[PDB]
Design a protein around this ligand. Structure first.
Ligand SMILES: [Zn+2]
Ligand SMILES: [Zn+2]
Ligand SMILES: [Zn+2]
Ligand SMILES: [Zn+2]
Ligand SMILES: [Zn+2]
Ligand SMILES: [Zn+2]
Ligand SMILES: [Zn+2]
Ligand SMILES: [Zn+2]
Ligand SMILES: [Zn+2]
Ligand SMILES: [Zn+2]
Lengths: 176, 175, 180, 180
């Protein structure tokens, strides 16, 4: 409950659709469930993914990467997850220490660009990995999986779900 | 009802989704810091600390007893897992029959029979597992909390990065 | 008689026509193995591997230029990012249908004739998605990291050299692009 | 002068002492590039790469033996799983302290003498974790998948060959191991 609220608020302000991350985790767990001979669990998980994805298009809109360049199919790609990619040499120098101090202050005060620039110029690189989900295609995949599960076609449902996981596109973007 | 559905499913899969959630809190905290959202980073790291503070008895259900590799002397919890699958994707009657047989076996909860049947037909299926050192992740999160309080955001980010790097990847057969 | 192994030549010729600088992938694998070697108590192997990375990266800028992603949008530092590795990302539902069977045959015939766009579009319309994952290496920063690691190794600072090399690996940016 | 590149030799000699079959890594990179080539409408290149993989994998069973993980626990199929690639997994907090600095110096001294165990223990007890991620390739099954792909390519079944190769790649099992 607490975690769910905390993650939703944080993700909302990061423009990340945690609801999509959760649908994909349901999918992941469904495939696991199948191969543990837990088809009832797999149904509950796939039905939950369906329910999450069924949130209306207007609600997904603020999370859509409208300028997404690498699409596997013509769809609206939603930023469903993201993470920090970071590189430095891990050797302390006074220039780096000063740069970190400056960047910390700038982050505390909301000067994101100044923080990132300051770190960059000191040899500390930081960007965002993004995970992009095709909204209508993933909806389709989950529905197809539901039907296969109803038919007892577990292995086949597992592969449709794998397909849905393989449709998540990885991208990188600068933080600003 | 996602929280409930995931908990019930993960409990019977011997996966500590509470651990996965703590790790996602950590992941989001690092993001938050670099978007100039220190109050959010605090909320997220405090939530990670709360989840991790669950008692040792509750974590024990999910502790891996056969881990061949550990970085630190600690209890490693299976906090996440996923299916690793390999086949040739060329349909044959022999494979299709094996699949039908496996499906029948899974319907009745016969995991071993299902996995053996698929393996004999050239369809491989095992588990990837993600292992979290319990006390070391507790320690890293507390350390990060203190650094955030001190305004040492970049440093807290690296402590959290180390916590993420402490997740050990493993594989195991489904049987 | 089957082709004899000629891996360096085969990869180079193939990667050149794919706009992938396999020389960069080779430099990064050297780096990877150097870190492994350090933690096996093999400093000499680590030196040889890091020196090899340095030699590969020292290839002149003109030679790297055709592999630079000049429109790279996610950069950690201001640098020339080289496409050093790439792989196929593929998604389909694995359910055969007549429409997919026909589309796959058609795509195969198009690829036979080098009609990449037609093939990818045909697969796409049948629900078969295919794009490229790319691995982008900052040329000057990686040169710098490798040189720095060489100096640390000379000083016997093996753990530190390991972390510099780790940072070099962490400098590799992951991107995706449509195949056409 | 600086060491000129001799990448295949340097990688082989290092991997041999590390018990990593780089020949396997090379075959898998050939397979990866072959899939890439197919989707660029380069079937001739895909053939050369797949043929090179076949040639590398055709190395005799005796030669693969020193790299077989005899006690592999997570097999997809009954096969000899070869350690074909490995990398360092490392975790620390990146906060310098006198205790960690001392431990790092001590670890470096121990690694200088080839004392892997002492070094790794020393780091571990200072809160620096270091293990190996290993990549395990089923030898017979991978040979089989490459031959099968070769036939499909001869038949112009490019998409299908791609998926057989994808399955070969999905047959690589990832494990972790203690350095020592
Ligand atoms: Zn200083
Ligand atoms: Zn962002
Ligand atoms: Zn399990
Ligand atoms: Zn076990
Ligand atoms: Zn039957
Ligand atoms: Zn293991
Ligand atoms: Zn390309
Ligand atoms: Zn991009
Ligand atoms: Zn000191
Ligand atoms: Zn080793």
């Amino acid at each position: 409950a607490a975690t769910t609220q905390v993650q939703k608020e944080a993700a909302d302000v990061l423009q990340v659709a945690v609801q999509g991350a959760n649908a994909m985790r349901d999918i992941q767990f469904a495939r696991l469930a199948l191969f543990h001979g837990q088809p009832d669990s797999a149904k509950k998980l796939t039905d939950d993914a369906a329910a999450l994805l069924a949130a209306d298009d207007a609600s997904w809109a603020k999370f859509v990467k409208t300028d997404a360049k690498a699409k596997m199919i013509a769809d609206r790609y939603v930023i469903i997850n993201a993470s920090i990619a970071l590189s430095e040499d891990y050797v302390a120098t006074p220039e780096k220490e000063s740069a970190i101090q400056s960047a910390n202050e700038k982050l505390a005060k909301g000067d994101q660009k100044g923080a990132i620039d300051t770190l960059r110029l000191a040899g500390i690189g930081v960007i965002e990995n993004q995970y992009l989900m095709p909204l209508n295609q993933t909806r389709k995949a989950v529905a197809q999986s539901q039907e296969l599960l109803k038919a007892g076609k577990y292995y086949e449902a597992n592969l449709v779900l794998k397909g849905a996981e393989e449709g998540i596109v990885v991208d990188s973007e600068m933080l600003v």
